[PDB]
């Protein structure tokens, strides 16, 4: 299914952004410090989120919560099982044609689970 090199790149990004907690600030500051504007803008358009300028209605977020267990995600982040977390949210993304930067996408999905779950 998922290419393991992309899984590990996503897991490493999650580990770096969220080493000190899954927070909106840690996500946005990590993304703005590590990705080009163009890459960020593509994710913002795909997910209808604002990253480069808590819980409000979002299409994709609701479909994410209907398919993927919030409890499974939060447990993975609690244990710092970042590659477990990555495969779980990447399975949702590839299914739904979320083809923008997988590290940013995974970061946003993990944030949604923790801050909105």
Author numbering: 58 to 110, 126 to 189
What did the study's authors say about this model?
All residues were visible in the electron density except for the first two amino acids, the last two (169–170) and an internal region corresponding to residues 90–104; this latter region notably corresponds to the GelE cleavage site, and we postulate that there is natural flexibility in this region. However, the two cysteine residues are co-localized within 3.4 Å, consistent with the ability to form an intramolecular disulfide bond. Interestingly, the structure resembled two “clasping palms” comprised of three α-helices each. The first three helices are in the N-terminus of EntV whereas the second three are part of the C-terminus. The two palms enclose a final C-terminal helix, α7. The NTD (N-terminal domain) external face is negatively charged, while the CTD (C-terminal domain) external face is positively charged. The positive charge of the external face of the CTD is due to the presence of many lysine and arginine residues, while in contrast, the interior face that interacts with α7 is hydrophobic/neutral. α7 itself is strongly hydrophobic, as 11 of its 16 residues are hydrophobic sidechains.
In previous work, we described the inhibition of Candida albicans virulence following exposure to the 68 amino acid bacteriocin, EntV, secreted by Enterococcus faecalis. The processed, active form of EntV is 68 amino acids and is both necessary and sufficient to inhibit C. albicans biofilm formation in vitro and pathogenesis in both a nematode (Caenorhabditis elegans) infection model and a mouse model of oropharyngeal candidiasis (OPC). Notably, EntV appears to have no fungicidal or fungistatic action, but works to inhibit adhesion and hyphal morphogenesis, both of which are required for virulence in this species. The protein is further cleaved in half by the extracellular protease GelE, generating the active form of EntV which comprises the 68 amino acid C-terminus.
